[model samples]
Target: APQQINDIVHRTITPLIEQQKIPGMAVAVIYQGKPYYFTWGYADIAKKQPVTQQTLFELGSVSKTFTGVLGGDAIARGEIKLSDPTTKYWPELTAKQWNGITLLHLATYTAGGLPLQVPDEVKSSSDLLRFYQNWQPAWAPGTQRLYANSSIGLFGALAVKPSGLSFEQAMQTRVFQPLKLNHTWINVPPAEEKNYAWGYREGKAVHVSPGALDAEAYGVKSTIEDMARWVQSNLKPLDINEKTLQQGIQLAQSRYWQTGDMYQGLGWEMLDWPVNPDSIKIALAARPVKAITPPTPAVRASWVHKTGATGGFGSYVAFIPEKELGIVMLANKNYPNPARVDAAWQILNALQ
Candidate 1:
């Protein structure tokens, strides 16, 4: 089976990257309880630096998972409540736009009609307040689901503020350090910057900008080793002893809402693993819409997923608890979100 997996990755993945001119990328698969790794192409085309388990790749929005987990942790510690008004953290949002919104609605992207991107005019935290102060939703909160970064970014800020730590500090102290994720960072230090893979677009090096609550959104950079640590945490939750850590994992991974044919958890997208082709097609073709009241969570069929992209990078993270399976992939070149999902699904099928 390992040999089969190796073949699929080599034949399918290697050629795809070569054909697409992806300068560098990495893929990590966790089968059963064991981890298998593959590295392809260059971290630097001119320097000819090949990607390794330690090479850093921008995580894009996959960073949201960490925030989602942080939300769960805070909830467990009784530091925050899903039902509490989001305005509780920042009282400036007295307007009706935020009337029905709660940490729960925001976390699940059920705070309807949030724009995909935060407005450009808003620069600081105070700016966000001014933007939302007069804003109103297209649909009532908790009734419809439209995927938006603004919701989670705002919620992440609310969660971090109460902990009395900045977003990076909270993630480092509460999540990464406890989980032993050494190669993960919100911002790579200047000295260790050499380890980061340079992203390219149209044969030129490019960088993506961060929006509101940027780092908490698409700003994580991590290596295969760090991603492996994170994937393992999601796969086995009860094994964690920290009250907050264990509780966060449980809640973050819990099935909290459903949209169309897919389910939504705190920050992860939920699907039935060894999934149907139709379901995959729908997800790959569209962003989340048609928010419906979801039934109770069915953990046995859960497939936790998240995809992210920046101007020059793309990323994917997913795992199925029932099968004890997971996959992580990162690339310097951005592509359609479907490309990441398709490649990952193929690898999963090979494992099957």
Candidate 2:
């Protein structure tokens, strides 16, 4: 088994790294409750730092899930109601332009036609009010599925709005601290920030930039050790004694939409049941069901699946929850590469 694993993982990434397709990355896996890690290329190509399990990368939209967890936790504590209208949180966003959209709609990316990025005209919380002042859905809320950053971006912001806590502060208390994830951060500590990777695009180096809603949506930086533990948490979640966390965990992965081959939880994506993990493309291309319909959160997802990227960083996390096997891959590249999925599938296949 060891030789088979080494053979698979070794071939999985070295060729691409040799070709300069990926500068360097860390691949972490969880099988039968143990963590396994592998690295290739460089964490900072210029510095010659080897990417290790401790190297941090911009998590992209994988950061979005943390918002869901915190928001869902707030809901679990009776701080907010999913069905409540957006106007309840901020009156400037009226029902006419917002068209009676609910909090759940925003969190689920079912907000109909939210843009992928915050409008240039939107510069502050006050500007967001105006952005929502005239926002209208092209398909009406809950009709089609479009992966939108602005969609979940606001969701992350509003997730903690009721508590009057900054998003970073909320996540600190509600998630990072509670989960004992010392290396995950929305705002990296000055010293550990050095460990952050230098990302690349087309062989040219780049870095994550700022945006009006950037912090709300995709600002987290984390290490493989943190991700490996995160996967373990999802695999064996709903800790009985931590009632609020257990409930939040339930809401975070709860299904909000199921269309074609994709079943969407609040923050993660689920390949349709009776699905093949090998054919990820089929599920990747899948979309949400059509026709406007109200949504209710499913109890929990049976699998862990999500992909994320930024201007110069890419990340992917996938797992078989029932089998206790999964993978976390992060590279300093703009968008995710199919090779990450293929490599992960190869390793997962062997484990099976």
Candidate 3:
């Protein structure tokens, strides 16, 4: 029999494709320790390539989850401790004060309040390194919260350097191998190019032009099938080693800092139940801020979710721990105002 979550995903997603006029989409559901995947539309609209379970879509900020996994694995290997200063890994960091920043602070986005996005002038990795070197903290490390892609991406670089491995290699060795996610990668090789989905811009398909400064920040390509493996990792963490699993969960669940009404963990954001309509939710609910605080016991507390948007891709992936169900939606179209949460909500409502 088809699982309740799988049926819900199919019913909700098919309509989303039509309503949003998305070229292609893929979804995965992990419920009751089993995985189900569904794909619809096309991988390449111009070439008439039908979307399939094997089709790859860019993960956008969902890539940070993989970054967090690598951090946990590094801790497991004893190459670095989360509590250690970030300067320990990159001693040349200019700001003497930054020497006090810890890997935990970087992972959790609480290190001296880094900005959400660095300006385009800060183009190269070295430029980014210099920016941090001279950066002054608005608040003490771990005391204030701000979402900085540069900070987290730099942390991935730090993890690679200290572990004596490249970023791609470390991700492959630690996170990807254990989870059996074969098609996910920071850089898709030429051999796999044919499987890549065309990123949509406006209403038309546009190939993602290569070359971005922060590849580690938002450059992972994956299929819904592979993302389902990731969902399984979050759902049944017991399958992995206890220590690593605990650390991964800790990173996700940790509340290191608060940004207005939203609380942020390592690479994930936490919002109270009953989302405020006036709040600003960005980068997959990664950067949420509310103008006004709500009364106690904020609206519905059953779901924790993350949303992602790239140049031509928009995505939402969430799981209700209480319900033991996960949902993933990867879209090729870049709607002006992507309704990722609303789309997920529709699926959740149908499941109910």
Candidates' C-alpha lDDT: 0.80, 0.75, 0.70
For residues 1-352, could you state the per-residue lDDT of candidate 2 as single tens digits? 3666667667876775565477888887787878878887788877889888889998988887777778788899888887887767766665475756778878877777787678666777778776767666776777667777788877777768888898888888877887878999887789996788888887877777777778768888999999888777766675434677667766777767777656666677776433565556332231456432444443333556778788788888877766777888888885435666666676777775
Measured with C-alpha atoms, the lDDT of residue 170 in candidate 1 is: 90
The TM-score-based order of candidates, best leading, equals 1, 2, 3
Q: How much does each candidate deviate from the true structure in C-alpha RMSD?
A: 2.5, 3.0, 4.7
Question: Of models 2 and 3, which has the larger lDDT?
Answer: 2
The superposed Cα distance between candidate 2 and the true structure at residue 239, in angstroms, equals 3.9
> Would you estimate the TM-scores of all the predictions?
0.93, 0.90, 0.83
Model 1: per-residue Cα lDDT over 1-352, one tens digit each: 4797788777768766876677888988888967888988888787888899989888888988999998889988889988899889978788877877898888877786676668878888688887777667777787777667787888898988788998889989999999988889888888768888888888777666656788776788899888977988888887776879888988887777666667777777787765774576233222445443443543755767898877788888878888888899889998776767777888777775
TM-score, predicted candidate 1 vs. hidden true structure = 0.93
Q: Which ten residues in a row have the lowest lDDT in candidate 1?
A: 281-290
Model 1: CA > 4 A from native: 281-298
Top TM-score model: 1
Query: How would you order the candidates by lDDT, starting with the best?
Result: 1, 2, 3
Instruction: Candidate 2: list runs displaced more than 4 Å.
Output: 1-4, 16-20, 277-301, 335-337
Weakest 10 consecutive residues of candidate 2 by summed lDDT: 283-292
Error of 3 at 153 (Å): 1.0
Which is the winner by TM-score between candidate 1 and candidate 3? 1
Q: Name the candidate, 1 or 2, with the larger TM-score value.
A: 1
